[PDB]
Design a protein around this nucleic acid. Structure first.
Lengths: 129, 205, 123, 82, 80, 157
RNA sequence: UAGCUAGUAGGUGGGGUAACGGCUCACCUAGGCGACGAUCCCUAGCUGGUCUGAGAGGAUGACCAGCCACACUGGAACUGA
RNA sequence: CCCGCAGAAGAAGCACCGGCUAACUCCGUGCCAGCAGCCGCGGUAAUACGGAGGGUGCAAGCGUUAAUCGGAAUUACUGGGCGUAAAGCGCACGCAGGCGGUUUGUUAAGUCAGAUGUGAAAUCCCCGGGCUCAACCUGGGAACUGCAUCUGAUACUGGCAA
């Protein structure tokens, strides 16, 4: 009954890349906004806009490098059935560093590399190839 | 603990001049290389991948004279040391004392250098050493005792090693009958042909 | 495979059973010959197989296999049984050691002598 | 009694000693409190194995420990040598 | 600051003592999920003052019976 | 220079009104030793005709994959029919540690150092296809810099 | 193996202990544990470690070191720090 | 430990050789004798039995048996499955339990960072040292993935309130 909304966002991004959608619409929340902010910051999406005022909708523009999708794999790592918190040394280098792990540290949502350079760990939200 | 059998049969099973007889009469002129020592050596086999790995390991073990328990100890030591593990394995085999004796020009073979080291002839850093598998450190001085300096087989070995190639990680004096182990050899210094990747892949199973 | 179902009752290692249960986790065991007979194998092997009944020192009575061309075992002979299933023979899952307490070596043998307890022949 | 003494380690006919302070009813290599150094009687030429940190020695003797004969001799030599 | 554990009361029914269930949010060593484990303690209720349904701060002390080595310091969030 | 390797020779049979007819299949790989891998599957009534079929099939359908100095770029999971291959790049040295068919594919591919493992069915045709699928699934730092739209140094740090 | 437990669970007071305490007695209350497995049955000295394994794990606990228990079997105290 | 003597003198076995699994031919026998880890071999031309010659592997040891892990992703946390291969309760309701849409504030239990105490010594790992080398012994470090406390952070999970 929609326990996990972040995995719903990730499934929408994955299915929109697989079906070659131009843009993906979903309900928003500030966690989704932060994850989409860092997904723009690395270059997996093109951009995003948050539109509604009381029933807020978030719309993402999916990037397509000529043949493929830019996002190939994206996995929800911590899930509501099994929360996964790593330390500052256990922060994974995803796809030998070519992909990111979105980590929600105590300074907010950032990537694996910014959490390691800042010196702090936390809940890993998703691996993004 | 040594092989001590027919040596040219060991050279003929591998198909390569292992230099384990000598250099004076040529090894094809002894005879019968390209041929396995069978009664079935006229038929060459298909020789599968584990066979190929085992033959390269047997080649490297016979070209030095090391038995298998010492060789797998050398493999563990090359594996736990940082760097290319196969190059560390060849460096640890070139670091052996009797090999340094044979490369420097004392002893015409590796078995002759082993009998020379065994019979208390060679002093490394001012102390005589019995053990063939002694690791010669860099900037070590390899020399002979007083009594064993006046030994004619060392003269003949100096001559036929003058016809050899004089490897460059060690420096031979040849007149004081001394030499120094200058540095650690790299892969390009030594032998250019043997496949150490086949050896590390065997023990990695 | 749900992690809650593994927390409530975990994954179960099956059980390891032994095909040599009369040896009692020992390499060999001494027993005495109750009977020395022969039997026939299962259907594609067609021979006569020298199999002896053994009573063991722990009280198990098992059938062992006397392997090698011709033996000297009798009634009430003390032998050393070893372990190792005989594939054709049903119910036979131990071997007798040749070179044992009473069981002699095989006659006129020269290759794999130590599997049959034959001393090295001198010339 | 708390005493400072020598525990014997090392190989056969090549002894090594840990100078170590322990309750004196315990076994020779058994349960101790802290090891305040080591001693090597056969060490080599050029090799100096005799190490004593005098701070923990003086701390434990001020707490009421009892120095053994070898340990008191070794304190004498490392305290007159420096 | 004294070492103090926070727990709900489970039962109040004997005399001058209560039985209190502290919950810890442990992690599973095998499977990695944070699971809730519970610990019932017999706590010494001098003055017999608190009831069945509340939360109580509790520290440990000298043994007082064959159980009951913990004592009430105070009741935070009394209940009905 | 197109070095070639024979992986498997199988004997298959087709039954007819007379009796069983046996033919032989060959699974081969070719490669430049620098990036380019190809696999071929020949089938003929006798063996060296099947080898020549497999070689001239393998030489045409060759795909180029990217690889570092002698190594992979990242861990990568190749999958096929019953094969669930997992290959991890390596440290230098240590050779190709891989089983059989995957060893031959990675050796003609020019991958010198690898750590590999096959899961599921280790049938040779399907693990060759899973291996070459994991190889062509691999991507380079310059191509992932082409995708995400930034220089490679901002990705690597 | 699904119910177990009356000094059993708590209180007051006397006694006892180097020391708190159902540790022991008289009294009062009727409680305590248990499906986050009580009770019963089978097996077992425990740990640092050892072996294996890429790791996670699994198997183990000879030697060496720490703790425990025992000293023909069952029991009891004396002496003494 | 060093020195002198004598002399090649006193010093090489064990398993295997059809496939897996490196290494082959002749002879004896004929579903017998026997072998065998699994597949299986032996029916008159046996690379599978027994001997021989040759070879292979290890070596003062070499084989067999027993036992443990590995391979086995074959109890799968990392790391499996469930239409037909083994496997969706016959179907619901529902207590315990597990999970929890969205905004703001607070607490800071989970989480993260740092510090302090602790985690005996040995062992394992690294850089060295001493035994002619090695095994072995030894100096310093790292580690002991943990627990408790203290100081903060507060994104995420939990509590409290709206």
């Amino acid at each position: 009954s929609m326990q996990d909304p972040i995995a719903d966002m990730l499934t929408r991004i994955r299915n929109g890349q697989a079906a070659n959608k131009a843009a993906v619409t979903m309900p928003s929340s500030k966690l989704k906004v932060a994850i989409a902010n860092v997904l723009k910051e690395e270059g997996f999406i093109e951009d995003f806009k948050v539109e509604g005022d009381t029933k807020p909708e978030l719309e993402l523009t999916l990037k397509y490098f000529q043949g493929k999708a830019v996002v190939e794999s994206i996995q929800r790592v911590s899930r509501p059935g099994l929360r996964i918190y790593k330390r500052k040394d256990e922060l994974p280098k995803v796809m030998a560093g070519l992909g990111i792990a979105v980590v929600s540290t105590s300074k907010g949502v950032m990537t694996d590399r910014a959490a390691r350079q800042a010196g702090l760990g936390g809940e890993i939200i998703c691996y993004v190839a | 603990a040594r092989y001590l059998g027919p040596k040219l049969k060991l050279s003929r099973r591998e198909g390569t001049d292992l230099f384990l007889k000598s250099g004076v009469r040529a090894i094809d002129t002894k005879c019968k290389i390209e041929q396995a020592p069978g009664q079935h050596g006229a038929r060459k086999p298909r020789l599968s991948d584990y066979g190929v790995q085992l033959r390269e390991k047997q080649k490297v073990r016979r070209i030095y004279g090391v038995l298998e328990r010492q060789f797998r100890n050398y493999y563990k030591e090359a594996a736990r040391l940082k760097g290319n593990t196969g190059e560390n394995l060849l460096a640890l085999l070139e670091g052996r004392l009797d090999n340094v004796v044979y490369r420097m020009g004392f002893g015409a073979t590796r078995a002759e250098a082993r009998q020379l080291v065994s019979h208390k002839a060679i002093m490394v850093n001012g102390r005589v050493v019995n053990i063939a598998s002694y690791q010669v450190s860099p900037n070590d001085v390899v020399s002979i005792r007083e009594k064993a300096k006046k030994q004619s087989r060392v003269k003949a070995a100096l001559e036929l090693a003058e016809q050899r190639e004089k490897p460059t990680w060690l420096e031979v004096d040849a007149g004081k009958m001394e030499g120094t182990f200058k540095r650690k050899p790299e892969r390009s210094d030594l032998s250019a042909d043997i496949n150490e990747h086949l050896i590390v892949e065997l023990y990695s199973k | 495979a749900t992690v809650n179902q593994l927390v409530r009752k975990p994954r179960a290692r099956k059980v390891a059973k032994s095909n040599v249960p009369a040896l009692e986790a020992c390499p060999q065991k001494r027993g005495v010959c109750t009977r020395v007979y022969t039997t026939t194998p299962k259907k594609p092997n067609s021979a006569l197989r020298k199999v002896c009944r053994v009573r063991l020192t722990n009280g198990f009575e098992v059938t062992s296999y006397i392997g090698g061309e011709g033996h000297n075992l009798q009634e009430h002979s003390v032998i050393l049984i070893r372990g190792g299933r005989v594939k054709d023979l049903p119910g036979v899952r131990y071997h007798t050691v040749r070179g044992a307490l009473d069981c002699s070596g095989v006659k006129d043998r020269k290759q794999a002598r130590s599997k049959y307890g034959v001393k090295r022949p001198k010339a | 009694m708390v005493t400072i003494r020598l525990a014997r380690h090392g190989a056969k006919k090549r002894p090594f000693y840990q100078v170590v302070v322990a309750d004196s009813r315990n076994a020779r290599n058994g349960r101790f409190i802290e090891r305040v150094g080591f001693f090597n009687p056969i060490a080599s030429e050029k090799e100096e194995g005799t190490r004593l940190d005098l701070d923990r020695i003086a701390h434990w003797v001020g707490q009421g420990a009892t120095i053994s004969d070898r340990v008191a001799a070794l304190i004498k030599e490392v305290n007159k040598a420096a | 600051k004294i070492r103090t554990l926070q727990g709900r009361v489970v039962s109040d029914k004997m005399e001058k003592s209560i039985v209190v269930a502290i919950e810890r949010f442990v992690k599973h060593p095998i499977y990695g999920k944070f699971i809730k484990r519970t610990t019932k303690l017999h706590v010494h209720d001098e003055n017999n003052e608190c009831g069945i349904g509340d939360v109580v701060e509790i520290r440990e002390c000298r043994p007082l019976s064959k159980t009951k080595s913990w004592t009430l310091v105070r009741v935070v969030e009394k209940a009905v | 220079e197109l070095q070639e390797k024979l992986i498997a020779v199988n004997r298959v049979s087709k039954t007819v009104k007379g009796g069983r007819i046996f033919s032989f299949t060959a699974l081969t790989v070719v490669g430049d030793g620098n990036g380019r891998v190809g696999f071929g599957y020949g089938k003929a009534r006798e063996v060296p005709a099947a080898i020549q079929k497999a070689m001239e099939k393998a030489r045409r359908n060759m795909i180029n994959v990217a690889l570092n100095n002698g190594t992979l770029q990242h861990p990568v999971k190749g999958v096929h029919t019953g094969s669930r291959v997992f290959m991890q790049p390596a440290s230098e040295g240590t050779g190709i540690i891989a089983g059989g068919a995957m060893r031959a594919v990675l050796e003609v591919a020019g991958v010198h150092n690898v750590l590999a493992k096959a899961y599921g069915s280790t049938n040779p045709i399907n693990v060759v296809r899973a291996t070459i699928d994991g190889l062509e699934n691999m991507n380079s730092p310059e191509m992932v810099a082409a995708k995400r739209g930034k220089s490679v140094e901002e990705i690597l740090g």
